[PDB]
Enzyme design. Structure first.
Site, PDB file in Angstrom:
ATOM      1  N   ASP A  19       0.846  -1.148   0.000  1.00 58.74           N
ATOM      2  CA  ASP A  19       0.000   0.000   0.000  1.00 58.74           C
ATOM      3  C   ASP A  19       0.933   1.265   0.000  1.00 58.74           C
ATOM      4  O   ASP A  19       2.156   1.167   0.255  1.00 58.74           O
ATOM      5  CB  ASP A  19      -0.772  -0.138   1.335  1.00 58.74           C
ATOM      6  N   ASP A  21      -0.378   5.203   0.799  1.00 57.07           N
ATOM      7  CA  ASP A  21      -0.785   6.139   1.858  1.00 57.07           C
ATOM      8  C   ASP A  21      -0.994   5.459   3.209  1.00 57.07           C
ATOM      9  O   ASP A  21      -1.758   4.503   3.335  1.00 57.07           O
ATOM     10  CB  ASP A  21      -1.985   6.979   1.335  1.00 57.07           C
TER      11      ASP A  21
HETATM   12 CA   LIG Z   1      -3.442   2.913   2.856  1.00 58.63          CA
END
Ligand SMILES: [Ca+2]
Ligand SMILES: [Cl-]
Ligand SMILES: [Hg+2]
Ligand SMILES: [Hg+2]
Ligand SMILES: [Hg+2]
Ligand SMILES: [Hg+2]
EC number: 3.1.3.21
Length: 251
Positions: A19, A21
């Site tokens: 991932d 953010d």
């Molecule tokens: Ca995230």
């Protein structure tokens, strides 16, 4: 039963999916600033609510739900591309993220990928802001039909790296997802991945209620070993962790 306690713990894996953010960069302040701006001329839009429910969602999908008049892919791309410069130049790495990305770069590029709900123009700038090389296998908002919490981004990643799910023998196709958000953890689990929860956006108490298999404070807990051409594996090492499920090491 009770969590694992011994450190370090070592896991052979076939691939790793990240991932962005909350996992590589703490972009949440920038994203929150964007939603507050987006809402400033929309009485029906509760930015506070949206900020806190939509971690790991595509901006297009949050808008489709909460302000559908504006759910237009090109428009969303335009809005998101502005975020890093306007609101995100002070965004910091999740501690250890820069180091871990560099260690991954030393491996064959087919051993890891990024799968983010951010659009490409936003996510690429996050890498630039941290002085991390942009990932070679890089899945973004508009590369998928369904976004997190649907598994598609992570299925696309594991399949692209050559490790589709092996339902009959999951130990033959071993993929770990690194995630901060419930949406991403659900997506990763539904893509048959082992999940490393990062306790940035949420704390340990919260993440212990979610489907992550191991929870770490940040990436200073995490190292990678040497690629093994024979088994097409790499050694993932957890020097430390906050919590690990009793079955973490089993696929
Ligand atoms: Ca995230
Ligand atoms: Cl856990
Ligand atoms: Hg939040
Ligand atoms: Hg990284
Ligand atoms: Hg997987
Ligand atoms: Hg968990």
């Amino acid at each position: 039963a009770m969590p694992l306690t011994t450190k370090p713990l070592s896991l052979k894996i076939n691939a790793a999916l990240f991932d962005v953010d909350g996992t590589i960069i703490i972009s949440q302040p920038a994203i929150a600033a964007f939603w507050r701006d987006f809402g400033k001329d929309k009485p029906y839009f509760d930015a506070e609510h949206v900020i806190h429910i939509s971690h790991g969602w595509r901006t297009y999908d949050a808008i489709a739900k909460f302000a559908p008049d504006f759910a237009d892919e090109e428009y969303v791309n335009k809005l998101e591309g502005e975020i890093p410069e306007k609101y995100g130049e002070h965004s910091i790495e999740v501690p250890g993220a820069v180091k871990l990305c560099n260690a991954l770069n030393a491996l064959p590029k087919e051993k890891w990928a990024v799968a983010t709900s951010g659009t490409r123009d936003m996510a690429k700038k996050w890498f630039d802001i941290l002085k991390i090389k942009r990932p070679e296998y890089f899945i973004t908002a508009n590369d998928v039909k369904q976004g997190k919490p649907h598994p598609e981004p992570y299925l696309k990643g594991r399949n692209g790296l050559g490790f589709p799910i092996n339902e009959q023998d999951p130990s033959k196709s071993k993929v770990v997802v690194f995630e901060d958000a419930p949406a991403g953890i659900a997506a990763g689990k539904a893509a048959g991945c082992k999940i490393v929860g990062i306790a940035t956006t949420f704390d340990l108490d919260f993440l212990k209620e979610k489907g992550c298999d191991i929870i770490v404070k940040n990436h200073e807990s995490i190292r990678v070993g040497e690629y093994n051409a024979e088994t097409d594996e790499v050694e993932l090492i957890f020097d430390d962790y906050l919590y690990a499920k009793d079955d973490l090491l089993k696929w």
